[PDB]
């Protein structure tokens, strides 16, 4: 098997700046017919991979001219002259000169941009869920950069920890931001033991902590 | 307009079997060899098998030799993969790939195969009504207490696509998943436009269409 080594694992590049991804093979990828069968693949978040470059430097159908390919033999480099918002995701190199087809580990391309403040929305539990004995309070943080944030659940003005799980989306292909949801799951008996349910958000964009609250009434 | 459509994914017990399909259009399927590629959740790409244009010769990866079988039906433009003696190591998103441009030029959308000894549990859809509301309100749906992955969440039967953020599933303490799918819409359409979330959990055969009404 030909071993594909991609470096690095993560690349934080600013919007509009150039980026380059290296790929190294354990053997020469030049076939017996004198053609280097190395390809570059792009896998956007939550999508299948699409072919960017084939035979080192040849651009596939509908591939922008900002994507470039260089290197020959065992060292290869994929270059983007201007990093755009559609360029988020993992990039894989692939050999097709031997029949044990081997891929690289991948290089995640994270996009650096300006600060974006999160949009904080709180959702009380539905009455349908209240009939089920459970109750979930969702705290939504929409479109913010950077990814780092702190969401604090204060039930009845008392900090709560241990009853909440979070989920951060991947970086968006239109604005290069993130979205976060925090679900506080409590029983209906424990839900009706308090009145004020609030989630306090602290972010680099927010000058002062934003708090979205509702009362059980 | 070259499009590859896969099907056949779901949940399977260890040792059992599962068969995947891959519908090919936009090109002459009979003159191109095909590949199967898989990707474990959060991991990289791994080649599985290749088949000749006529099925005359077939090559498999060493990790699947003796268990996976690649086949094709050119009369249907369909590529198949029979997976016997499945293991938890075989849990991945499986892609079919067309040969072209000295590479894998076109891929399918991917189908998820999970190998687990856990029971299949259907989800329960709960509405997230817009109440707190500048002129852009947010609403969503709660897919809670389901197993295993995944669930297909669409809005307005696929008509509403912009502003949607389907959050990744989170494994609860009860061994069940629960995600949330929200969408930001203009506040002037909270009553003029109807918003429905369409949930489909394939392993349990539960299709739920729930309307998310506003909450004054």
């Amino acid at each position: 098997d030909i071993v594909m080594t991609q470096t690095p694992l993560s690349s934080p590049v600013t919007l509009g700046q150039p980026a380059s991804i290296s790929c190294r093979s354990s053997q020469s990828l030049v076939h017996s017919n004198g053609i280097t069968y190395l390809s570059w693949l792009q896998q956007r978040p939550g999508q299948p991979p699409r072919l960017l470059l084939y035979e080192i430097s040849n651009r596939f159908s509908g591939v922008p001219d900002r994507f470039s390919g260089s290197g020959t033999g065992t060292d290869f480099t994929l270059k983007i002259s201007r990093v755009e918002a559609e360029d988020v995701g993992v990039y894989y190199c692939m050999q097709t000169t031997q029949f044990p087809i081997t891929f690289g580990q991948g290089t995640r391309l994270e996009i650096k941009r300006t600060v974006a403040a999160p949009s904080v929305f709180i959702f009380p539990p539905s009455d349908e869920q209240l009939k089920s004995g459970t109750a979930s309070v969702v705290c939504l943080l929409n479109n913010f950069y950077p990814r780092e944030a702190k969401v604090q659940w204060k039930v009845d003005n008392a900090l709560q920890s241990g009853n909440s799980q979070e989920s951060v989306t991947e970086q968006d292909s239109k604005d290069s931001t993130y979205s976060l949801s925090s679900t506080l799951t409590l029983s209906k008996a424990d839900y009706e033991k308090h009145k004020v349910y609030a989630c306090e958000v602290t972010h680099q964009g927010l000058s002062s902590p934003v708090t979205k609250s509702f009362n059980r009434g | 307009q070259v499009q590859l459509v896969e099907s056949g994914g779901g949940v399977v017990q260890p040792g059992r079997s599962l068969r995947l399909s891959c519908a090919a259009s936009g090109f002459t399927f009979s003159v191109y060899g095909m590949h199967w590629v898989r990707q474990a959740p959060g991991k990289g790409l791994e080649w599985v098998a290749v088949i000749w244009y006529d099925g005359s010769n077939k090559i498999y990866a060493d990790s699947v030799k003796g268990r996976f079988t690649i086949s094709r039906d050119n009369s249907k433009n369909t590529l198949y993969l029979q997976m016997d003696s499945l293991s938890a190591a075989d849990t991945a998103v499986y892609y079919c790939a067309k040969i072209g441009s000295s590479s894998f030029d076109y891929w399918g959308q991917g189908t998820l195969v999970i190998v687990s000894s856990a029971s299949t549990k259907g989800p329960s859809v709960f509405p997230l009504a817009p109440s707190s509301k500048g002129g852009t309100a947010a609403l969503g749906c709660l897919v809670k207490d389901y197993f295993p992955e995944p669930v297909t969440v669409s809005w307005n039967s696929g008509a509403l696509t912009s502003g949607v953020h389907t959050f990744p599933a989170v494994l609860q303490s009860s061994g069940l998943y629960s995600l949330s799918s929200v969408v930001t819409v203009p506040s002037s359409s909270l009553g003029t436009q109807t918003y429905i979330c369409n949930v489909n959990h394939k392993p349990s055969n539960t299709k739920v269409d729930k309307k998310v009404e506003p909450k004054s």
Partner: peptide, 12 residues
């Protein structure tokens, strides 16, 4: 050796 880009496809 075999060419994975030529051999699995239909012969010209």
């Amino acid at each position: 050796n075999a060419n994975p880009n030529v051999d699995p496809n239909a012969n010209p």
